[PDB]
């Protein structure tokens, strides 16, 4: 229950699953990924119930879960993943994949309708160990663990929270950048010949709920927030 | 992928803006921003920033001053500029860059030498407005204004206090919220003497760039904002060099 403890954590996230960076900021490894490769295992404990999660390191993907002798792959997931992913275990399926529009689907809830930080992610994991009804549990897992890594600012969200020492759910901050991190890479990759210029207006909300259109990368919000870009040119 | 298009801002949020219209020899002027076509200027993949037609010159009626002019009858070396993080917008054939003498509205725009300086500091995108964040530092302790907007250490976040809260224009500047005249300043950095806050008098001093390093930089000395060693509820903040420390490093929560 500490922020170096989580700091250090997402840190060795990001760099872990990063290949050679474009204007400063690093990027996840394109298709040069074996299938013997491309899988990063990470662990989470808590009251001493702890989870393993599969991502993908291309995109940042979670394929499967871990509990103990039973594992859980997300509908998404190619064959090849499950034969050499958790099999010394009972493998399963579930009946959504690690879309944000699936998982709420499941859920019947939100991000925005979603409380996070320390008293959150711990019977986060719980469900997880246990079982069902753990589609939420994803929400508050995945946002605040892979989502935290991609950018600082969520980081900064989930880790701001651990200082005050409250709760609280995701705003329109989060969830534009969030649901943005596939174009924004894609604008800040295709856009080289325009040296620092996209093709439109990507808009991010301020924590005022102020709607952004960022046109560049010589934003505040791009330059010092993006940790982690997914790999796509032009 | 070819070509895109977008604003210039600058110099206390003001535009950079073709005189009226013309064509051929239009000098570039500070004008307040608005969405009109002569203030959009279309970045090519060959580093010609061209508007109206034309690409953006270096003119010598003897000095040197930014210009429009037909892209085939003007030489390759005077049509190529050159942006960068740092808020500069340089011709590398001259080693001259884009500089504002005044911040005055419909003021001639003139190019310069390289001084880092704020009059000097540019912002292509089309958001110009200047960006209201919360810059939070080591410990979790954010940026306040300490005494009357004079002195800024760090002290614990409220979270909704607009002593802690600055604003960020185009011309790479660190300003006040509630008193956008005065602004970060730095000093005779030999010797961690302390950063303040004074009016933003232009200088190679008050420009300010949030790196991707994590840290903010001053161009002019490549300096960062860094600590006077853990103090912040009622110390001072200095100019130290690329230390690595976790102390060196903000964010600019938004």
Redesign the interface.
Known sequence: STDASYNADIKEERDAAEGPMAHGIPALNAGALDEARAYATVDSANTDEEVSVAVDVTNLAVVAYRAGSNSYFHAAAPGSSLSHLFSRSSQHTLGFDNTYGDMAQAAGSNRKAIPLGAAALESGIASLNSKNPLARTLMVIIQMLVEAARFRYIQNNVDVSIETQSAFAADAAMISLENNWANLSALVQGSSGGQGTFASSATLQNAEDEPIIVDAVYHPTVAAVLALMLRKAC | ???????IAGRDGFCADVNGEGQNGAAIILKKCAENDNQLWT???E?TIRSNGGCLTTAAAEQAKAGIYDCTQATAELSAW??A?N?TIINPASSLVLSSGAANSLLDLGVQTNSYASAQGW?????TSA????I?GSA?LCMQAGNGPANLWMSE?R?GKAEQQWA?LTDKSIRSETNSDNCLTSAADAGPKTILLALCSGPASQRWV?????SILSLYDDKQMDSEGAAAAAKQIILWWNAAEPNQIW????
Do not use: P, Y
């Open positions: 992928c070819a070509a895109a298009t977008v604003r970045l090519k993949r580093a050159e942006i993080d808020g912002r292509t995108g089309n958001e960006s209201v964040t919360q939070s979790q976040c979270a960020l949030f790196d991707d390093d994590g964010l600019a929560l938004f």
